[PDB]
Swiss-Prot record, chains A, B:
<keyword id="KW-0472">Membrane</keyword>
<feature type="active site" description="Cysteine persulfide intermediate">
    <location>
        <position position="359"/>
    </location>
</feature>
<feature type="binding site">
    <location>
        <position position="394"/>
    </location>
    <ligand>
        <name>FAD</name>
    </ligand>
</feature>
<dbReference type="InterPro" id="IPR023753">
    <property type="entry name" value="FAD/NAD-binding_dom"/>
</dbReference>
<feature type="binding site">
    <location>
        <begin position="37"/>
        <end position="38"/>
    </location>
    <ligand>
        <name>FAD</name>
    </ligand>
</feature>
<feature type="active site" description="Cysteine persulfide intermediate">
    <location>
        <position position="163"/>
    </location>
</feature>
<dbReference type="Pfam" id="PF07992">
    <property type="entry name" value="Pyr_redox_2"/>
</dbReference>
<comment type="function">
    <text>Catalyzes the oxidation of hydrogen sulfide, with the help of a quinone. Consecutive reaction cycles lead to the accumulation of a polysulfide product on the active site Cys residues; these products are released when they exceed a critical length, typically as cyclooctasulfur.</text>
</comment>
<dbReference type="GO" id="GO:0016020">
    <property type="term" value="C:membrane"/>
</dbReference>
<dbReference type="GO" id="GO:0019646">
    <property type="term" value="P:aerobic electron transport chain"/>
</dbReference>
<dbReference type="GO" id="GO:0070224">
    <property type="term" value="F:sulfide:quinone oxidoreductase activity"/>
</dbReference>
<keyword id="KW-0547">Nucleotide-binding</keyword>
<feature type="binding site">
    <location>
        <begin position="11"/>
        <end position="15"/>
    </location>
    <ligand>
        <name>FAD</name>
    </ligand>
</feature>
<dbReference type="GO" id="GO:0000166">
    <property type="term" value="F:nucleotide binding"/>
</dbReference>
<keyword id="KW-0274">FAD</keyword>
<feature type="binding site">
    <location>
        <position position="305"/>
    </location>
    <ligand>
        <name>FAD</name>
    </ligand>
</feature>
<comment type="subunit">
    <text>Homodimer.</text>
</comment>
Length: 421, 421
């Protein structure tokens, strides 16, 4: 309302949860902040692969949101938004109730586009997913069914995927867990299928010696790897795969039996956001400027996986570049700053800064990680790391981020200054 | 003097040059800042290996100091200090003139301890050095003599060395340059000799896969490598090397003929500083507290290679851990802050922060670099990088640091925030 603007944050994930706290800290008691989310709990997404192999449980990586945001004066609605009317500035919830906003910050993450590959939905066949804790639990249940009745394994990433690290991580920890259980020798075949033009491309044209290291890692585990692949369908417990050459021409088709499978799907924008006229590209991603502001609606901002970022290359099989946590938090920080600036008679000038990708993977006792910036080469930083210390750093960061999601954030967010003293 | 304290910075190197500018910026026109240095020019030390193979010249990496510091109100004395009387607070210069100080910041870098190995002084025999531009020029002259009359090459690091990267870099670029000149096949033997307990230890117990990468790099260049070595003498154009086992017992002695040689020497404190009673350890390094303040004299501070840092391990052949640029600048920044604090009735609380080591090496088209922190394992960051981008980053940083040494510094110093936007 006038003089007391209502800011709604849609989606309580890696971007949206911090966005809610930061928005309320920034605006104070004179304004209303409402966080709306499909789930009543927060989950630490990067730990889902471990849930998928039974190395972690839901309770380790997830917690109920309400009390933590409410104690900060933030309203919480645990309902999915089904429609957004950008003209009237009304959000229609799954229960049919309506929420009006003065500013909207979209942080809705990805729609997991299983529809791209008929039969690939985790509920339709043997190809599972570890992108959410619900799905990771389902993946682990199927993994146990595999242990009871061993059969072919296929892990990888679909055409159009932008999130490749977790596929490699999952393959490695499944292989590891099999060995632990003395079951590895009972698997007839273990295959890695990816849309990447080469192993370790990771949607970022490689980082450090990711190609050499991941290539050798898969080989060492007896995992046969295929690149430039797209899955045309999953049917009768078989994955139908087409492999192309540099020019997109078929060099082979394969039919792979699958007892246990996990393929990272392509991401699209969620339906309620994609459905807003003029807001998004054909993929459903919000078209925003450098200030995280929608190009169509001046009072809609967006951050996280939900925003559109232009491609920098065109791979033989479509692939996308990942949108990772540090860049996401930079988007959130900028959006919050610029909304506040708007509420104070200014055009905020803050941007997300330089494009970058960062990621951790934990194989158990040791981890891998990378940092790449900016997007195109030659880069200013292009590094891949491996070792026990990376495992320890992942453990530490998870513990930290979860505590911060409970205690609240406000500051820029980062402890780079704390560990450098 | 009273109400107008005189601060003297001794040594105009990586630490001292910035220290002079930062001190004057911090104190302003009410105080006097004098920079005293043995040479009338600044040199960018990390580029010396390239001067040593003729890939760079003195004029590329060095420039006269006077005008740049004087235009900032800093007094410049291009004389070596020969004696320091800490009681009277008087510095005796090489010309016999005396300079009084109220505060002294020692930034005198290393004494190159060739005396540890009889015959190893660059002027005494074929074993040269690339630690200074004077010496690197001499190394290149001898390298040309090698080209005229090919013979055995021996490159490496002496017992007690703490600076290992440049030995590997130099070996690699000499091998590279030989190939360029079609002379590589004319070298009867090319040997790498190091006090490190293993290749790629680097005085920091390894970083990333430094061991594997440097091991393979030397092998690829046909360079035979020996670890756990100390040179007992250089004589009649032969290097007498003793190799020990884990327990320091001789497993062999070797006598290596040398036509062209380069061994990084051990570092000690410079004589004028080491000669100050109670100031230093037996090695000549200033014993300081966390605030960079001498433990003996409250008005003497120290930064850079000149300070004592306790060892964290005891290798079969003595080795030391490197003191590198980012940590050095942190020492400088803290010293300046705490001297100013003293001049304003306070004990400055600023410290150099977390121990870390960083380094670049440039092989021509591609570079290597590492970051390790803190000193003991498991680390919070332990990374090794290689590629064209590292070459480009080294070129950029050199260009930047040299310009900053001409234009002046004041700020914390760093552009991490500039390239992240
Ligand atoms: C398996 C996996 C591993 C990853 N590993 C890393 C890593 O190591 N490092 C890294 O930096 N990044 C990693 N990422 C990438 C990225 O950081 C995460 O995907 C991150 O969670 C994305 O944040 P987000 O805020 O954009 O979306 P999300 O965290 O997915 O949050 C979206 C939120 O919006 C909600 N929502 C969706 N639709 C609606 C609706 N219509 N109405 C209301 N709410 C809705 C969702 O329930 C969810 O709470 C990983 C990603 C995955 C999937
Ligand atoms: C070959 C080489 C390569 C290196 N590579 C890297 C790298 O890649 N990355 C990195 O971060 N670090 C690197 N270092 C390590 C370190 O950063 C440098 O040695 C750095 O120059 C040390 O800074 P300093 O200020 O302590 O000493 P210096 O830079 O050596 O400065 C000491 C100054 O004191 C003067 N001085 C000495 N005695 C007296 C006296 N009695 N009276 C007056 N003045 C005196 C000297 O002339 C000199 O100007 C490298 C070192 C060397 C030798
Ligand atoms: C972060 C997301 C992107 C990637 C996700 C998943 C990656 C899976 C990791 C597979 C790699 C396993 O293979 C592993 O790699 C490194 C090689 O560089 C080796 O380790 C080697 O380098 C490391 C440091 O980096 C040294 O500490 C070690 O002594 C050395 O042998 C391991 O001996 C090898 O077993
Ligand atoms: C910084 C100071 C400390 C070290 C100083 C001097 C180091 C000398 C460098 C010798 C290494 C040369 O060997 C080189 O190493 C890397 C392997 O990791 C290889 O490069 C490999 O990893 C890089 C990324 O890191 C990839 O871009 C490349 O595609 C891959 O092949 C090169 O193919 C090999 O030729
Ligand atoms: C320098 C080499 C590795 C050490 C990096 C330490 C800190 C970076 C952690 C990466 C990370 C960031 C930044 C991050 O913002 C984030 O989102 C919350 C993650 O999880 C999804 C991350 O894993
Ligand atoms: C993250 C991987 C590598 C990129 C690092 C970029 C900036 C760091 C440069 C290293 C360096 C620092 C910090 C430094 O302070 C310094 O002294 C002036 C150097 O020269 C001696 C350096 O080479
Ligand atoms: S998923
Ligand atoms: S990734
Ligand atoms: S030297
Ligand atoms: S080094």
């Amino acid at each position: 309302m006038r003089g007391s603007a209502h800011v709604v944050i849609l989606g309580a994930g890696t971007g949206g949860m911090p966005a809610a706290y930061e928005m309320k800290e920034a605006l104070g008691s004179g304004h209303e902040v409402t966080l709306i989310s499909a789930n009543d709990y927060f989950q630490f997404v990067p730990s889902n692969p471990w849930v998928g192999v039974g190395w972690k449980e839901r309770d380790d990586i997830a917690f109920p949101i309400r009390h933590y945001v409410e104690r900060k004066g933030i309203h919480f609605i645990a309902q999915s938004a089904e429609q957004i009317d950008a003209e009237a500035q009304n959000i229609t919830l799954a229960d049919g109730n309506t929420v009006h906003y003065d500013y909207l910050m979209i942080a809705t993450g990805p729609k997991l586009a299983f529809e791209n590959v008929p039969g690939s939905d985790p509920h339709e066949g043997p190809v599972q997913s570890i992108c959410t804790v619900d799905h990771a639990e389902r993946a682990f249940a199927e993994y146990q069914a595999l242990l009871r009745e061993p059969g072919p394994i296929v892990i990888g990433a679909m055409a159009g995927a932008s999130c490749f690290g977790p596929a490699y991580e999952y393959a490695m920890i499944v292989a590891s867990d099999l060995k632990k259980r003395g079951m590895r020798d009972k698997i007839p075949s273990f295959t890695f299928i990816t849309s990447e033009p080469y192993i370790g491309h990771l949607g970022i044209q490689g980082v450090g010696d990711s190609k050499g290291i991941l290539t050798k890692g898969l080989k060492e585990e007896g995992i046969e790897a295929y690149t430039n692949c797209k899955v045309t369908k999953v049917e009768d417990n078989k994955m139908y795969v087409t492999q192309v050459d540099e020019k997109g021409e078929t060099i082979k088709e394969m039919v792979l039996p699958v007892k246990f499978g996990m393929m990272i799907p392509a991401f699209k924008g969620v339906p309620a956001v994609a459905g807003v006229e003029g807001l998004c590209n054909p993929g459903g991603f919000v078209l925003v400027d450098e200030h995280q502001r929608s190009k169509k609606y001046a009072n809609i901002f967006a951050a996280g996986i939900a925003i559109a970022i232009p491609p920098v290359e065109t791979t033989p099989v479509p692939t996308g570049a990942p949108k990772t946590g540090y860049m996401i938090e930079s988007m959130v920080s900028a959006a919050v700053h610029n909304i506040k600036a708007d509420l104070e008679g200014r055009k905020g000038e803050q941007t997300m800064g330089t494009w970058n990708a960062v990621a951790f993977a934990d194989m158990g006792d040791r981890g891998a990680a990378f940092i790449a910036l900016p997007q195109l080469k030659p880069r200013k930083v292009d590094v891949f790391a491996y070792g026990r210390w990376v495992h320890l750093a992942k453990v530490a960061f998870e513990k930290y981020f979860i505590r911060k999601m409970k205690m609240g954030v406000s500051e820029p967010f980062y402890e780079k200054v704390l560990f450098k003293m």
